[PDB]
Design a protein around this ligand. Sequence first.
Ligand SMILES: CCCCCCCCCCCCCCCCCC(=O)OC[C@H](COP(=O)(O)OCCN)OC(=O)CCCCCCCCCCCCCCCCC
Ligand SMILES: NC(=O)C1=CN([C@@H]2O[C@H](COP(=O)(O)OP(=O)(O)OC[C@H]3O[C@@H](n4cnc5c(N)ncnc54)[C@H](OP(=O)(O)O)[C@@H]3O)[C@@H](O)[C@H]2O)C=CC1
Ligand SMILES: CCCCCCCCCCCC(=O)OC[C@H](COP(=O)(O)OCC[N+](C)(C)C)OC(=O)CCCCCCCCCCC
Ligand code: SF4
Lengths: 175, 161, 451, 71, 353, 368
Amino acid sequence: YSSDLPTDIPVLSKRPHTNLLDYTFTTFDKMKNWARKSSFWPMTFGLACCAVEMMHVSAPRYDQDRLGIIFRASPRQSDIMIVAGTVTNKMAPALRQVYDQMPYPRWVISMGSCANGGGYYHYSYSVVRGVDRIVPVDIYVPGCPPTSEALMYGVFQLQKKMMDGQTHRMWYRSY
Amino acid sequence: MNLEILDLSILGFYSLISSNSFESIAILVATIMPVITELWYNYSQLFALLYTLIYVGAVVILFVFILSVINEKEEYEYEYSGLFILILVLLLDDLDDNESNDNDYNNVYITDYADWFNNYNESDLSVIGNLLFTEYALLLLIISFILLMSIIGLILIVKKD
Amino acid sequence: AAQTKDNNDFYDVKTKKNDFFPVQVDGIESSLGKYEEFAKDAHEWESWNLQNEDHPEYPVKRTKIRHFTLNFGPQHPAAHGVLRLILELHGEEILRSDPHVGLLHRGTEKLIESKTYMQALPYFDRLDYVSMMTNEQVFSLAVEKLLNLEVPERGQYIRTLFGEITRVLNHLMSVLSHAMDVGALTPFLWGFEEREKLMEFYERVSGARLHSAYVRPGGVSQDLPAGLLDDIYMWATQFGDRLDETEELLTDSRIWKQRTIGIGEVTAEDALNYGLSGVMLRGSGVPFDIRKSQPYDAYDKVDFDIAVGTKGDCYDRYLIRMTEFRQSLRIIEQCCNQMPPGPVKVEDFKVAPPPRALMKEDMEALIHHFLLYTKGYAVPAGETYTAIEAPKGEMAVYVVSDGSERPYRCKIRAPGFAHLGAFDHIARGHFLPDAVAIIGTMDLVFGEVDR
Amino acid sequence: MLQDLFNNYVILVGILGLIFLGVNYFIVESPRMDENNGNISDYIEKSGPFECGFSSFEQSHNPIPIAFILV
Amino acid sequence: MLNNLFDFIEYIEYWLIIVAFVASVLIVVAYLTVAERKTMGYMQRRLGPNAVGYYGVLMAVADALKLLSKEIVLPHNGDIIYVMSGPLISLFSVLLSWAVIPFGPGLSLLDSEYSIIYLLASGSIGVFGTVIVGWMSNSKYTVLATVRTTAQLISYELVLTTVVFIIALIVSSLNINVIIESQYNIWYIIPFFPLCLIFFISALAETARPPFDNVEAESELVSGHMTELSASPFVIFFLSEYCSMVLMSTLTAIFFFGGYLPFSNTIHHLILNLFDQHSIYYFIIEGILLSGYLAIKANFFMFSFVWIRAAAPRLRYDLLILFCWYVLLPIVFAIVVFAPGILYCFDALPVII
Amino acid sequence: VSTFPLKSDINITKSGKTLLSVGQGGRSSRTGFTATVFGGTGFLGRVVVSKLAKHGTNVVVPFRNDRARRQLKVNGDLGVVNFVEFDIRNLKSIEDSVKYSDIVINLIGTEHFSKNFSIEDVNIGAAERIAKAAKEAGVSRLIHVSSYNANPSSSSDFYATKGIGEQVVRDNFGPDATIVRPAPMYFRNSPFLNELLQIKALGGNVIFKKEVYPVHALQVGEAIERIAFDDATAGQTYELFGKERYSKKELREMIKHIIHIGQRGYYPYSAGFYLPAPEPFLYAFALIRQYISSQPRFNVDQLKRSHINQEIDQSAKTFTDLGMVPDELSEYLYRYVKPHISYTSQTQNRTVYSKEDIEKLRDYVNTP
Ligand SMILES: CCCCCCCCCCCCCCCCCC(=O)OC[C@H](COP(=O)(O)OCCN)OC(=O)CCCCCCCCCCCCCCCCC
Ligand SMILES: NC(=O)C1=CN([C@@H]2O[C@H](COP(=O)(O)OP(=O)(O)OC[C@H]3O[C@@H](n4cnc5c(N)ncnc54)[C@H](OP(=O)(O)O)[C@@H]3O)[C@@H](O)[C@H]2O)C=CC1
Ligand SMILES: CCCCCCCCCCCC(=O)OC[C@H](COP(=O)(O)OCC[N+](C)(C)C)OC(=O)CCCCCCCCCCC
Ligand code: SF4
């Protein structure tokens, strides 16, 4: 039982493509990453005034549908959870249950000061000081409310992160 | 390889193990489908489509009645059965599948000789309509009379007022 | 009420009143003997049963099973935000509705008591978070009345001009989302571009698209930038066509009228008794408007009309909100023409902050600037109940002052809170899709409800 | 009238429907490649019914009155 | 090779024809989803999808591929029967209905004198697929959709079936291709304009499209029977619903607008006179023209399916039940008597030739 | 967990640093400790990270799966949980994970070998590299988790490599290395219980005959919390196991009655709840799937381990040395098999199995 681990093999995010199978699984990842980035389906989870700016992203001026963005009423059909509003202690168990009902892959966006850290109601007896206390957050959008362009910029950042996923090349090189 | 045998064996297996009412209406669908497909080939394509047109509409009305009556009874009632005895029962029923005991009628094949005397060729449905509306018009009118009775009958049974 | 031997929480034994003579039957016998001779074995014989199930007094223990309990919960598009609407359904007909609120309760009134009057103002922007500037106006009026101060003429017109711009913004959100819930998706998109044009007016004068802390006790935060009135007027010449095109799809549509006519009817007697106000009150035939009953902020110097319904249903309230659209546009035109010169805030530096240029040159201006932002301004002790004709209805604030710089108590009266309290009385007997229309016709924002 | 072409189409349609399910079963990454929350048969918080956030009474097998039964 | 390849292709030729036929239907269905979003966008003064593929031409691919790479939610892996039995039955019902749609004279996979019956019978099976999802389900929103789905079927099924029978009665034939050829001199839109409106209304009800979108009302039943569906089961149901939209749009072009018949007979002759009938290029162009005539008429009603969605609010299902039985059924039954009276009066009872 | 994990607010590490804890022991509190949890995205890792971060201890989580690390950050406040993208074949990445750490917990281990790593590389090579890197970084405490049947002379690859892993870690890091030998752990989504809950368990007659001493996973994570913050546990070996011995066949049948698979007599046999297969066939199927299936299946080594029962090293220490009473599987069995119940759904009455109910059910299973 002799083990000889190499010492200077770069991590996956730095590892270049050497053989033919690297390009094969990178092609597999990019086809999936493009599909999920293009078919960006958030869930209709408007809580407070942050939701109004979320509606104006669907407004004709910005037209989120032009990017492939469709809001779904069911957690089963949505892969993006946008927490747009204040999360109260009375609401926190409902938010966790809805998040758990989303099939993978799933991402969570925290929009506004309420969802980020509580904002104006940080020192309230009935307000959760950040939705990250309940669910993992992938991107935080600042503002009170964040503008329609501020939210779109955050979505673009998430789509940039999604396009860098290497799920199937990770199996080939890291597992 | 007659695959109709395998489909009926699967259908018969679930008939003995069906517990709730939803599985029973599923048995009905799993019965009409082999009938329609075996009618679509071989004997009569016309009545294979007629069976689909009429019975599928009856299935939906049957299904919507089940939603108003299910009362949790078969969701917790236990059944015992046993895998070995169920297979034994189906195996013995599989042994005898000769509906008739005229061996000559079942084993000797026959042919028909076509003729050109029928220059006016039309579908069987047109001939059925020709006789039903002329020769047996009384049957058609009585059937409408029965349909009228059903319409009145349904209202008086169901309507509260 | 109370557990009885014939009625408890788990089962009941109902016996209807008898509709036939109490016939006396004695000496039951057969051809072989008396009933008592065979009664021991008669339990196996159904023909020997002495009780008829058709009898009204036949004993039957029936388990008490709850109706179809559907949670119109927070994750539902029909609910305009967070609402756990619990419905007792018999099929789809509504028997009893239990609106559960507090999912957006953030203790705003508790937090206000720890803030100065200037610090407490931004909390009102987030109660009715589509009609932001009207929320600031009712709190500003309450503090001004307590302060015994009067806004100058130009300040009043600005709060009137943006008061109706706010009302147009609210009705755009209210009516189109109500139509979107019913099924009309296209009018929602048409009017939300008009919101973008009007929210640009919000951002031009304050720097915030939605939460513009512009209306403050003693006037407005800042004066209008140059060219705003021209841009407002240019929008005004075109907004008339947008309203007409909206009515092209709803007003005379037979599908829309079948979803609103006769739905959610409210009598004039019951509307007052449930504290309904605004379109809910005016839909039942009562011509009451706060802008006419108690004029405030230059509303007594503009000409406008109020639409009053007759049948008290959703369709009447839709028609009223469309008339209020045109009357608000009528007021906005007058404010543009009649905007006077002068200060936009009270000429009192002990309440209103001094100009920045004067702050950096005058000793007294610096002191007043320093103290207004560090300690705030004290308000004479007392209490007030100031109400304004909010787009949702009657919004009022009950502010208690103790002579300090922080309000002692700030009770916020929400028309949506009162409207939703009558949902059970209004939506009973209607079907499930009618509830969605009733929710939309009340113009419910749950930040206002759960303030 | 010959229907051999029709029979081939019906065979393809049946096979085509299984391809959509088979592709989806063989394309999705394994749970260990994802957050590794285990199999769906154990993730009861996900496989449970959807009630808009708040769990309610379980009335799967309760009677459902129908107002259009006569129709 | 060569000789063994030039007969292998002949051996597998008709499978390529079916595969091409399947691809032809799928392409229209795939881009109907893109067309609907683009059409509603401009009517709503937005743009619609234009950032997924060059000008949005890959929007359909991204939506399908992303959902095919999604987790399937079910109580257990062995429960693949429950959430797949419904959508598969619905998908098979609409795909088999396309077998009797002739893109040209005799260019249908299934030719029979009972094609009309097969069309209606196959479509009725798709209703059973929708009700399967509500199989003693624990989801209250799934259950409510099944009740509404049955109610809608009672509304349109009688009305839709009788309207098709009137067209068949006028031609005295239940063959779809015979119905198309019978419209050479007159398109049935002119004599039966009320029936075309009635057929389109029934088509909207059958597909659960707005203003009859009570099964999948987002503001009433979040997602209806699909609220518990994800990944492949959602795709198959989504594919089947849009396949019905194309099929019903194509049926409207067949029954009332002459099917594949040219808009102008003179223009059809001129274009084909440019090609030699002794070469295969004539029949390649001929198939393009005849199906192009069908495509233009079918695309108009697929446009109309989107058009009514962007212009009318949703109607309650109980109002729909009264609408069909009190209004549509008396009208269609009146016409089924009116039409034979006219034909017999002028000695014009139809025969098959 | 409790409300304050440390026995004192001032702790002096083996390297001489003085660490002061602040707060009462909540999310906003701190303990002054920074810990690195190798393999923190695994089954036991999430429990360990949750316990450490919930009291304010800074946790550094090396990871290779980007999606699996996201749920770990919820455990701690802002700045408490830190992530480093790492690979056991990248020496620099490992050295960055332990640079600021006072405690290093090595939870990296595997029962299978893949196209990139063998059993030796993960169980021995990875442990040695982590242990040696920790010492050069001056880490006060190192905690290594071996297996329950760790024996360098064992005929099983998993047990032998775990046994060698214990020795190679003590040589590199030094005598101050604490080694933990946990029994099979039961918990939500536990690998020990997932195999028993699988309806189609191929070769249950050959695999489910192993006898073990299952231990609660929450207690194993709790024990690691005790060991990390108690310097008196340095240099010792801990065998974590339950009091009651169980065979997988008894657990399999006990679970079958809890899930109510037997409500239909025919169903368990028809559904494939029993799949008797010869061991030579299972060896062939395990050998084939070692090079065809892309997901870790029942491999050859696990087939060998089915014939080896869990033997407890008496010389090693137990929960008693850490001042804990092992949890009984009968108490926690129902709550961890509850998600897999067929229908339940409060139809008539939930059958809640208590501590006494499970023990009685064990007698029924063994009753012929
Ligand atoms: C058509 C393709 C898509 C559908 C494929 C689904 C395949 C499932 C079996 C189809 C029916 C075959 C004949 C069985 C008769 C119906 C029996 C039944 O209830 O469905 C079987 C299904 C199996 O689950 P299981 O747990 O073993 O049964 C319950 C045990 N208490 O138990 C269930 O209750 C699940 C029912 C799910 C919904 C099925 C509705 C009926 C489907 C009929 C369409 C096919 C027509 C029949 C074709 C075969 C004919 C033998
Ligand atoms: N019933 C049980 O589970 C028992 C546990 N053990 C041992 O306890 C320890 C904890 O494992 P457990 O949580 O229970 O279950 P797991 O086997 O799923 O945990 C394995 C952990 O080690 C990581 N790992 C494995 N190989 C590598 C590798 N080449 N590179 C980097 N990381 C790797 C994994 O990271 P990643 O997830 O990102 O792949 C994972 O975090 C293991 O060493 C196990 O052998 C022993 C007896 C009983
Ligand atoms: C068969 C199943 C159905 C069809 C599915 C098709 C899905 C669409 C494809 C996804 C698109 C995508 O992902 O392209 C997006 C990516 C960009 O990736 P990025 O992350 O933005 O930058 C990272 C890439 N760099 C580092 C190079 C910038 O473009 C490419 O690199 C395209 C270049 C690859 C070669 C293209 C030509 C080769 C021929 C390809 C056609 C045969
Ligand atoms: S962050 Fe601001 S805009 Fe967003 S919900 Fe909270 S108060 Fe409203």
